RNA sequence: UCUGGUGACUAUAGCAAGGAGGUCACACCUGUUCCCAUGCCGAACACAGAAGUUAAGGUCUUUAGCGACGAUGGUAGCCAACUUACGUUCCGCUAGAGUAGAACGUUGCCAGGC
RNA sequence: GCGGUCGCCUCCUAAAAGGUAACGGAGGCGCUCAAAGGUUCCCUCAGAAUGGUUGGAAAUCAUUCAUAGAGUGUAAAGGC
């Protein structure tokens, strides 16, 4: 009954703060997850005018799957939009992204970095 | 009330203060269909608002067109004078 | 002596005298009211010497209603002495007022009293005054 | 699960005078008595209480003092 | 048991009392603060630490008064263990109805609370008392506030038939 | 507080000035720092 | 062009009421079997799964009552200037705050299922 | 003359850059801290009443009104 929190707010809100040293130039651009409630994702960004500049998609449906920890979670945690870019600072709103979100840091740590 | 006032003139330097001790005070009517445009009336023809609306009603405006019902709201009182400056209208639309 | 009781500094500056009014230019507890025409600083002492006279005149009839309250309170030396060696201790209290304020305030009692009760209450004051009658 | 604050404390089994309501959760040992399935297969020693034996709640019971008495020949 | 008598009669009404609009505005039980107090600074405090071993789960934090008038005010003393019920001991030592083992103020008051975080205090040897008294026959206060999923008392009081006070 | 020294037994030498308590801690302390002529952190002995 | 995601604007962007829809997508929803972990309770912090639902949030559309932006007409103040003794007054420039009438329930940046 | 002051830090006077006097009006310092230091995480203020051995209107953890009116080892302003 009583005042309930909606969490999408913090989220964002700590993205925010987070947001106060880490951007992508593009000759390090930052790569920036929104967890959701079954799937995650990932994205490539520049920023220096806010245009979209690189681009993936876990949901983009090469392949659909469950288990949003899954070999699915680390080909997302591979793909890459071929350019000249290297070994990115992973964007991390999300407790212990040196793991928990390790399911993208992991397996792009060969090839995009 | 048939009170008529006119539309004065703006670019005024100060030297009003003293073309004021003979009659008059500013006026600007608010309400669409015109604007600021500034109407000129004088005092001792509102010796006699007495009778006019009382405070809260019409008058006349005769104010070359669009002569409706206008309606004085605030109040700009003077002090140690008993006189009066810059009391304004507004339009009913 | 309307003087207050919790005070964080108890030396001040003398206020400003010049200008017209700010606040208080009408009157409301009561039909009629006292304007003030000229500068001054009414200091307490004033208003209760001319206040219990007001009501001796009012003989505790109607009610009245003070528009005016001392806050900064001045100081001011013992015995002559040298120039200099630190600042008198505080001995009064004082308000500024300016032309185009209302002092008092009274109701119900009749316009003959209002007149002869002013003027009466007037004659303390160091500032001229004239009479209001609710002009609107 | 974050442990790190409360001990070892489960659930246990208690039969009473009266349809032996008992059964939440425990942190109570003694000694077994015989176990079931309908209740716990495991050290049965939950003892006894007056979960359902009477409750004055809802229920009745016995008056006070005495009314006027001098009706009935005093 | 109790966590599914948060279930076994309370789904349906919970589901009814209120003819809202979809199942989740509907309400659940609020959670509680399961707390204790002292009414010494020393002894009793340092030596009322168990009784939540008892009845809640927490191991015991100290927390103080904050609020702390003219001669409440003291530090770090366990007076208050903050056992708030999160979700699994958010079953705790309070809905026991180890309330009746007393035969006294069952029925308190015409209605609970105007503020909507409702106090019900086992004043007394009220609550925790499975336990023989050996060493809780001494001082010990008691601090079970809450609130309850209903704005005002009314429609929380005539389905309240889970605690039945 | 009071001061006290310290220095790398191999350098032999005590540059390196700092301050402690004679209540908090009066139990000689001993830490490591860069002690001059080793190009290496090593133990120094706050005497 | 709808929503989800990033980067500009002075809350004009709001808290205060509601209205109505779907789960493509945000949500409420199941527990500790595991990664991490509350000196305190997996509600925040995590996991596999979602049979069950749209209240709420979420989005638009309504309230100018709730608050900021607040165009003119004046006016206080002020920079020169000629007077007089200034708690002033006249003459020239720049003219506020507050008060209204208002605008007012954001303009877009660049991408994804269409 | 007697008395009191004499170094360093903060504010007002000081007239919207900086600077600016009087035996003008207010407060402080002669340290402390192995942690109150460095780094990575994680969290959140007051003035508000609930009726809870006990109640000292104030012994408690909640809950919501909470807009920085809280907290900063030490005075005051500028900040968060």
Known sequence: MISKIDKNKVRLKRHARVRTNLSGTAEKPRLNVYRSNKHIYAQIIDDNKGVTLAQASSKDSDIATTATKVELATKVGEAIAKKAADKGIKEIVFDRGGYLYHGRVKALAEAAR | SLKSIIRQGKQTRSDLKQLRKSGKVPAVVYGYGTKNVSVKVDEVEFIKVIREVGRNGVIELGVGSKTIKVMVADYQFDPLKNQITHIDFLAIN | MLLPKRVKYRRQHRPKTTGRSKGGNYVTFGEFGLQATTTSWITSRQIESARIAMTRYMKRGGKVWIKIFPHTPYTKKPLEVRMGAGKGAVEGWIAVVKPGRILFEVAGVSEEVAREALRLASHKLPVKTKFVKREE | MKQGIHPEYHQVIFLDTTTNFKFLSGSTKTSSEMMEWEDGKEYPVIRLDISSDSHPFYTGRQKFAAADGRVERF | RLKE???????????KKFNYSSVMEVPKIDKIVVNMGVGDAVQNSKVLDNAVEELELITGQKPLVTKAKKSIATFRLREGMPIGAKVTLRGERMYE??????????????????????????????????????????????????????????????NTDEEAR | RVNVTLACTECGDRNYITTKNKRNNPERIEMKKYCPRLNKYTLHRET
């Open chain 5, 5 to 15: 008598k948060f279930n076994t009669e309370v789904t349906e009404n919970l589901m």
């Open chain 5, 97 to 158: 109805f180890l309330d009746k083992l007393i035969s006294v103020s069952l029925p308190r008051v015409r209605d609970f609370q105007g503020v909507s975080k409702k106090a019900f205090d086992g004043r007394g040897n009220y609550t925790l008392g499975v336990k023989e008294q050996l060493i809780f026959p001494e001082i010990d206060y008691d601090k079970v506030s809450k609130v309850r999923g209903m704005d005002i008392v009314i429609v929380t009081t005539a």
